[PDB]
Amino acid sequence: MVKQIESKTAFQEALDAAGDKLVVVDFSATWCGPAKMIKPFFHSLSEKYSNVIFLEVDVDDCQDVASECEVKCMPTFQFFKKGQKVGEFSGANKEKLEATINELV
Amino acid sequence: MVKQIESKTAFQEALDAAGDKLVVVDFSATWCGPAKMIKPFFHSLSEKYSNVIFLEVDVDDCQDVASECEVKCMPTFQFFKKGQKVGEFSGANKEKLEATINELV
Amino acid sequence: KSFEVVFNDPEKVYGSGEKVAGRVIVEVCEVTRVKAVRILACGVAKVLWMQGSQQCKQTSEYLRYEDTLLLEDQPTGENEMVIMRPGNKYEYKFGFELPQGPLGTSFKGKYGSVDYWVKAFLDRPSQPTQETKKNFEVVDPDLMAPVSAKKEKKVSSMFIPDGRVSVSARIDRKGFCEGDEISIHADFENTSSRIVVPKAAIVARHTYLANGQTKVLTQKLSSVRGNHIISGTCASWRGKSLRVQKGSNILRVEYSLLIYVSVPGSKKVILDLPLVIGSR
Amino acid sequence: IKSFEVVFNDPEKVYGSGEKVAGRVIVEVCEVTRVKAVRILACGVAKVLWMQGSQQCKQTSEYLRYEDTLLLEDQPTGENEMVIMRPGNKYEYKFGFELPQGPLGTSFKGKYGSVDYWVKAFLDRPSQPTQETKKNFEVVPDLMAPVSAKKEKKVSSMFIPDGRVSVSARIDRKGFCEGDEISIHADFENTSSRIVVPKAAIVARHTYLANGQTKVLTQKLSSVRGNHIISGTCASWRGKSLRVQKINILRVEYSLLIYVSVPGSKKVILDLPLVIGS
Q: Please provide residue D221's backbone torsions phi and psi, each rounded to the nearest 5 degrees.
A: -95, -130
- DSSP state at residue B8: S
Find the helix or strand (DSSP H, E) in which A104 lies. Answer: helix A94-104
The answer to whether the beta carbons of residues C45 and C112 sit under 8 Å apart is: yes
| C-interface mutation test, from A32, A67, A96, most C Cβ less than 10 A away | A32
Taking an 8 Å cut-off on Cβ atoms, the answer to whether C76 and D205 are in contact is no
**Chains with ≥3 Cβ pairs under 8 A against A?**
C
Q: Decide which of 2.60.40.640, 3.50.50.60, 2.60.420.10, 3.40.50.11540 is the CATH code for D141-278.
A: 2.60.40.640
Alpha-carbon distance C186 to nearest alpha carbon in chain A (angstroms): 12
Q: Do C99 and D205 touch (CB under 8 A)?
A: no
Contact A73 C234 (CB under 8 A): yes
Nearest-CA residue of chain D relative to B32?
D234
Q: CA nearest C35: which of C1, C82, C2, C69?
A: C82
- Which chain D residues are within 8 Å of B32, Cβ to Cβ? 187, 189, 234
Strand-pair partners of C118 = C41, C134
Q: Which residues of D touch B29 (CB under 8 A)?
A: 187, 234, 236
Neighbours of D99 (CB within 10 A): 22
- The four Cα atoms C67, C69, C74, C78 give a dihedral, to 10 degrees, of -30
How far apart CA D20 and CA D99 sit, in angstroms, is 6
SS3 at position B23: strand
What's the 3-state SS for chain D? CCEEEEEECCCCCEECCCCEEEEEEEEECCCCEEECEEEEEEEEEEEEEEEECCEEEEEEEEEEEEEEEECCCCCCCCCCCCEEECCCCCEEEEEEEECCCCCCCCCCCCCCEEEEEEEEEEEECCCCCCEEEEEECEECCCCCCCEEEEEEEECCCCCCCCCEEEEEEEECCCEEECCCEEEEEEEEEECCCCCEEEEEEEEEEEEEEECCEEEEEEEEEEEEECCCECCCEEEEEEEEEEECCCCCEEEEEEEEEEEEECCCCCCEEEEEEEEEEC
Distances (CA, A) of D80 to C204, C217, D77, D211: 11, 10, 8, 25
The answer to whether C215 contacts D68, with C-beta atoms less than 8 Å apart, is yes
Give dist(CA C153, CA C192) in Å, integer.
Answer: 10
Which of C79, C100, C213 should be substituted to probe chain D, the one whose Cβ sees the most D Cβ atoms within 10 Å? C213
Is the Cβ pair C219, D78 closer than 8 Å?
yes
The domain in which residue B76 lies consists of: 1-105
How does DSSP classify residue A4?
Answer: E
**Do C1-140 and C141-280 fold alike per CATH?**
yes
Alpha-carbon distances, residue C73 vs A66, C44, C270, D22 (angstroms): 83, 34, 58, 41
| HEC-encoded secondary structure of chain C | CEEEEEECCCCCEECCCCEEEEEEEEECCCCEEECEEEEEEEEEEEEEEEECCEEEEEEEEEEEEEEECCCCCCCCCCCCCEEECCCCCEEEEEEEECCCCCCCCCEEECCEEEEEEEEEEEECCCCCCEEEEEEEEECCCCCCCCEEEEEEEECCCCCCCCCEEEEEEEECCCEEECCCEEEEEEEEEECCCCCEEEEEEEEEEEEEEECCEEEEEEEEEEEEECCCECCCEEEEEEEEEEECCCCCCEEEEEEEEEEEEECCCCCCEEEEEEEEEEEC
Q: Which candidate, C244, C269, C267, places its Cα nearest to that of C255?
A: C244
- Among candidates B96, C9, D213, C154, which has minimal Cα distance to B87? B96
For residue D86, what are the contacts with CB-CB under 8 A and spacing of at least 6? D29, D32, D33
Residue of D nearest to C214 (CA): D212
Is domain C141-280 annotated with CATH 2.60.40.640? yes
Burial class, D149, CB count within 10 angstroms (exposed 0-12 / middle 13-18 / buried 19+): middle
Q: What are phi and psi of B84, to 5 degrees?
A: -90, 125
Cβ–Cβ gap C211/D74 under 8 Å: no
Chain B contact partners (≥3 CB pairs within 8 A): D
The resolution, in Å, is 2.0
Partner residues linked to C217 by β-bridges: C206
Q: Choose, out of D36, D77, D89, D207, the residue to mutate when testing the contact with C (most C CBs < 10 Å).
A: D77
**Number of separate helices (H) and strands (E) present in chain A:** 4, 5
- Chain D partners within 8 Å of C258 (Cβ): 76-77
The Cα angle at residue D154 between residues D151 and D160, in degrees rounded to 5: 140
Q: Do chains B and A touch (3 or more CB pairs under 8 A)?
A: no
User: CB C233 to CB A74 under 8 A?
Assistant: yes
Closest among D274, D264, D271, D272 to D165, alpha carbons compared: D264
Q: How many CA atoms lie within 13 A of C218 on its CB side?
A: 19
Mapped onto helix, strand or coil, the DSSP state of residue A98 is: helix
Please report, for chain D, the start and end positions of each structural domain, with discontinuous segments joined by +.
Answer: 1-140, 141-278
Phi-psi region of B91 (alpha: psi -120 to 50; beta: other; left: phi over 0): left
Cis peptide bond N-terminal to D198, omega within 30:
no
**Secondary structure (3-state) at B92:** coil
Q: Do D266 and C73 touch (CB under 8 A)?
A: yes
**Separation CA C23–CA C91 (nearest Å):** 6
Closest residue in A to C229 (Cα) is: A73
CA distance C219 to B77: 82
Tell me the nearest-neighbour CA distance from C266 into chain D, angstroms: 10
| Of C231, C151, C150, the residue nearest C191 (C-alpha) | C231
User: CA D190, CA C9: separation in Å to the nearest integer?
Assistant: 42
Residues on chain C touching D219 (C-beta within 8 angstroms): 77-79
Give dist(CA D127, CA D120) in Å, integer.
Answer: 21
Which CATH number do you get for residue B7? Answer: 3.40.30.10
Nearest to C225 by CA among C197, C255, C263: C197
Q: Is B84 helix (H, G, I), strand (E, B) or coil?
A: coil
How close does chain A come to C234, measured CA to CA in Å? 5
User: How close C215 comes to chain A (CA, Å)?
Assistant: 43
Give contacts of B90 with chain D, Cβ < 8 Å: 230, 233
User: CA-CA distance, C172 to C240, in Å (whole number)?
Assistant: 12
Q: Hey, what amino acid is at D98?
A: E
| DSSP class of A74 | B
The highest-level CATH class for domain C1-140 is mainly beta
